Design an enzyme around this catalytic site. Structure first.
Site, short mmCIF file in Angstrom:
data_model
loop_
_atom_site.label_atom_id
_atom_site.label_comp_id
_atom_site.label_asym_id
_atom_site.label_seq_id
_atom_site.Cartn_x
_atom_site.Cartn_y
_atom_site.Cartn_z
N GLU A 179 -11.01 -0.72 12.46
CA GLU A 179 -11.45 -1.60 11.39
C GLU A 179 -10.39 -2.67 11.11
O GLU A 179 -9.19 -2.39 11.07
CB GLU A 179 -11.76 -0.76 10.15
CG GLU A 179 -12.36 -1.53 8.99
CD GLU A 179 -11.31 -2.18 8.08
OE1 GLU A 179 -10.11 -1.87 8.23
OE2 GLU A 179 -11.70 -2.99 7.22
N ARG A 227 -1.97 -6.31 11.65
CA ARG A 227 -3.01 -5.51 12.29
C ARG A 227 -3.91 -6.34 13.21
O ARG A 227 -4.25 -5.89 14.31
CB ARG A 227 -3.81 -4.84 11.18
CG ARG A 227 -4.84 -3.89 11.65
CD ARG A 227 -5.42 -3.16 10.45
NE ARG A 227 -6.48 -2.25 10.86
CZ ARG A 227 -6.27 -1.05 11.38
NH1 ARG A 227 -5.03 -0.59 11.55
NH2 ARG A 227 -7.30 -0.31 11.73
N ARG A 268 0.86 -1.18 0.00
CA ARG A 268 0.00 0.00 0.00
C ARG A 268 0.90 1.22 0.00
O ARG A 268 1.64 1.45 0.96
CB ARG A 268 -0.94 0.02 1.20
CG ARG A 268 -1.72 -1.28 1.41
CD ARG A 268 -2.82 -1.49 0.37
NE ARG A 268 -3.27 -2.88 0.34
CZ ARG A 268 -4.26 -3.38 1.09
NH1 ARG A 268 -4.92 -2.59 1.93
NH2 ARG A 268 -4.58 -4.67 1.00
N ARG A 305 -0.15 3.02 12.94
CA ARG A 305 -1.07 1.92 12.71
C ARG A 305 -0.91 1.26 11.35
O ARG A 305 -1.50 0.19 11.15
CB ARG A 305 -2.53 2.40 12.88
CG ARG A 305 -2.76 3.34 14.08
CD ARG A 305 -2.35 2.72 15.41
NE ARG A 305 -3.38 1.84 15.97
CZ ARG A 305 -3.20 1.02 17.00
NH1 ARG A 305 -2.01 0.96 17.59
NH2 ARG A 305 -4.19 0.26 17.44
N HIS A 306 -0.13 1.84 10.43
CA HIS A 306 -0.08 1.31 9.06
C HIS A 306 1.34 1.17 8.53
O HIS A 306 2.25 1.91 8.92
CB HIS A 306 -0.90 2.19 8.11
CG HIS A 306 -2.34 2.28 8.49
ND1 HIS A 306 -2.85 3.32 9.25
CD2 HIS A 306 -3.38 1.44 8.27
CE1 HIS A 306 -4.14 3.12 9.45
NE2 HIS A 306 -4.49 1.99 8.86
N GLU A 309 -0.44 4.30 -0.35
CA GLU A 309 -1.24 5.40 0.18
C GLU A 309 -1.79 5.07 1.56
O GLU A 309 -2.82 4.41 1.66
CB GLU A 309 -2.38 5.73 -0.78
N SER A 347 -13.09 -5.83 5.81
CA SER A 347 -14.28 -5.52 5.03
C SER A 347 -14.64 -6.72 4.17
O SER A 347 -13.76 -7.36 3.59
CB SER A 347 -14.05 -4.31 4.10
OG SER A 347 -13.64 -3.17 4.80
#
Lengths: 505, 506
Positions: A428, A479, A247, A253-254, A249, A431
């Site tokens: 989150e 995560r 990723r 936390r990322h 973008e 999904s």
């Protein structure tokens, strides 16, 4: 001056630097790991052990050491005896911290106050000791300093020498638990007849890390999304993939590269078939993680957390009027919350009722199709925890504006989609959705979203020769470990993390 | 008009599946249709239309779901009108249909289907999705043996519409078996307390180069360096399953630019034979379990015939040639001094210098003990091994130092050779294992001798400086092991969406 030199040769078999392990012998000795030292049949036996020197010191006429191998540690000591010369005590006292030693020792049962070592019941009386490899005497940081509770070794220093940090109790336990999450994810899905797939991470067009690919350019895949759908159109009924995702973008936390746990499956009628699998999968993983008490406590001692609650109580379900799908019980709960069944008891709230719940505390009210940002996801999670008692829930029927071009819209209201998000501790984690399996409606949603599917013509074409209705979901591995353990930074759960500023180690 | 509405309930296009009902009907998979409790029952099936034709007042179809197929028919009778027989006859092949049909037994079996004992009497049929009537190629043609007469599909056309190709028996079976290889690889190692790791594929220095924000980065060829470094964080045993990248511009039947590596690294107490012991037991476990998937093996073999892999010597051949047995202290009298570890797995090991001598029995240009065994030579060696020992699987022990990477530990007695081995399946290399150099200074010294530049990987070297465990490991290409196990002609047959220098699509 030569008999003294011959004494050097006498003590070589008792202590010193062993020759480098170089495959000159095979199964010539029995090597007992530190983890087996509390086996009762080893008491009073002389064993050979390979371990790290956690600490060692000469004191009086004796040497005292703590030997370590990951989460297992044991006290060792030596005293001047007939078999053991004073020079061995000097040698033991000066071995560098983190050196690897081979020790021949008698296992002794002892009654002493509990210390930091995990084998409390025993102590090794050292007869011989040789260094296998010697550590530098300057460490980048000590293990103890790296093991302190947060308020110190800063994170970038620990990541730069990750091989040292991994030796701490909590870091070791974090990555053992990470391995268990992967194991339980796959076993659950294999039990349910999901086939493992491996799809390419190099792709032709951004659908963006651009790479040089012989005479031309290619790109790294953000996820296996397009391929896991295409394989179902090859008549594979259900698939999973575990592999890297990228990723482009920098938050706590990322990451820029991490590991995706991905699932795709045919559906007969409804994306709740996907959600049913996802909830059962998470229940299975959480149930099995709970049994790894050694690892959990070893995380908790440096990084305290409250154990995740993912089930409502039967009492709270009854008090609030939560509905039960498998029982046909319609909710009377004001926010119309449901669980699928009284065994997993996992909370589902429709998206519009999630907005209504947020609006109880917000001064600036949200419309039913407004998007819930990151601050309001955490607020929703807190409101859910306070009302329903759970750290885990699903928000069902997300607005169309918030979802990718391949998400099936609701037939009754195209403002919303046949999709859901899952949340752990208010953040989150996954999904899921029914996909658009019709090429014309797939292009129509893309055009509505001003997404050009010309670069992914093959994906669209894969729906043109008959397509199965289908859906799926994805999960970030690092995560889910971070949120399950309540960790402060996702880098604590990625072995060699990647972010916009970090490409090493 | 009211008659057309009546017929709509019987046949036509169903509404798009859009999550408007949940568990409202019981959908029976085609795989279950031979269950005896379905006879004389009318059931709901969702399936592919493989073929369909009309013949008077009757329509005949073959419905398919992967490897399961069944004949369906309808006749004008009762509530089935001629309009429905016409509808069935014109459905495009590869459409997906929902059929309500009675499961009937038949006397003369329908040998063209896998459910030969039964036939479906169709009462209702609606399309779920319609296929184009123009296919990139037919399933029939894509399934035809290269030797059989008739049109075949070439590999590029196959890969350009891989979703069609995967529907064939053999292609579907290949990738089910690929999944099983991963499954049994991981289960063996989990059983032996190996921990799964995930190491980065983006690295800061080499040769796929990518733009990485304000700088450049590279793709890792393998997790080699990281799997060693993790052992220095005291994890005793690790494995990894993930993508690997080869940047060589090689377009052959055997090479992919992206594939999947099955990687293992572990501490050793004394000897790299501890690594080889694990690797042999791992392959034994996999092969023994793959052999139980007879359905899939037969579905590959009917299009791509192969002789099942033999990976064990027989006890009789061991005795006949005087092969040694390590676990029983049996010293070989075999002229090439071959050994197996034990009488259970019976997996052949030949020292590299005896492999050279075996090759030299048929070579006019004799090789030296330190000469390298190239790709023409590996297949000759595997043929000689198959003819002498009867096995398609063997390891060659103690490779020359000149053929091995800088991190390979040299033999103490003879630095011309290394503490390393190769494994071969059907005469082709499938895995290299070795003891690594865990001493930082000797590791720099071997790199210098090999003229290898370690400036781009200081952290790997540094990981051995704070006390290091003796260790070793091996890697296996997933697609290549499936290819060699099944004897496939092209590695692209075992890679779902292949990558090579000329192919980045689909």
């Amino acid at each position: 001056a030569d008999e003294k030199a011959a004494l050097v040769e006498k003590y070589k078999a008792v202590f010193g630097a062993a020759p480098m392990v170089q495959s000159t012998t095979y199964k010539s000795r029995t090597h007992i790991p530190v983890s087996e030292l509390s086996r009762p049949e080893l008491v009073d036996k002389t064993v050979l052990i390979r371990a790290r020197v956690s600490t060692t010191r000469k004191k009086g006429k004796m040497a005292f050491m703590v030997l370590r191998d990951g989460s297992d540690s044991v006290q060792a000591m030596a005293a001047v005896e007939g078999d053991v010369p004073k020079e061995m005590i000097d040698f033991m006292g000066q071995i560098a911290t983190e050196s690897i030693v081979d020790v021949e020792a008698t296992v002794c049962k002892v009654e002493q106050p509990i210390t930091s070592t995990s084998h409390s019941d025993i102590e090794l009386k050292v007869k011989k000791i040789h260094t296998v490899t010697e550590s530098l005497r300057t460490l980048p940081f000590t293990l103890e300093d790296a093991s302190r509770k947060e308020s110190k070794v800063n994170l970038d220093t620990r990541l730069n020498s990750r091989w040292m940090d991994l030796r701490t109790l909590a870091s070791g336990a974090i990555f053992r638990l990470q391995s268990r999450v992967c194991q339980y994810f796959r076993q659950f899905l294999i039990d349910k007849d999901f086939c493992e797939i491996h799809s390419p991470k190099i792709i032709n067009a951004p659908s963006v890390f651009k790479l040089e690919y012989f005479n031309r350019f290619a790109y790294l895949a953000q996820s296996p999304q397009l391929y896991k759908q295409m394989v179902l159109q090859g008549d594979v009924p259900r698939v999973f993939e575990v592999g890297p995702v990228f990723r482009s973008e920098n938050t706590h936390r990322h990451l820029t590269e991490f590991v995706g746990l991905d699932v795709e499956m045919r559906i007969d009628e409804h994306y709740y078939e996907v959600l049913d699998v996802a909830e059962s999968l998470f229940n299975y993983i959480f149930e099995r993680l709970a049994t790894h008490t050694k690892e959990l406590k070893n995380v908790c001692q440096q990084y305290p957390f409250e154990p995740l609650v993912w089930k409502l109580t039967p009492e709270r379900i009854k008090e609030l009027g939560v509905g039960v799908i498998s029982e046909g019980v319609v909710p009377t709960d004001k926010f119309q919350a449901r669980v699928h069944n009284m065994d997993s008891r996992m909370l589902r709230i429709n998206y519009m009722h999630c907005i209504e719940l947020l609006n109880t505390v917000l001064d600036e009210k949200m419309a039913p199709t407004d998007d819930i940002n990151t601050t309001n996801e955490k607020l929703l999670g807190k409101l859910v925890k306070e009302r329903y008692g759970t750290d885990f829930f699903i928000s069902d029927r997300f607005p169309s504006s918030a979802r990718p071009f391949y998400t099936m819209e609701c037939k009754d209201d195209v403002r919303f989609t046949n999709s859901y998000d899952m949340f752990i501790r208010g953040e989150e984690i996954s999904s899921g959705a029914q996909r658009i399996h019709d090429p014309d409606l797939l292009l129509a949603r893309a055009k509505m979203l001003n997404v050009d599917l010309t670069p992914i013509k093959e994906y669209v074409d894969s729906f043109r020769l008959g397509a199965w209705p289908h859906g799926g979901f994805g999960i970030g591995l690092e995560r889910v470990v971070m949120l399950y353990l309540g960790l402060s930074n996702v880098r604590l759960a990625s072995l060699f993390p990647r972010d916009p500023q970090r490409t090493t180690p």
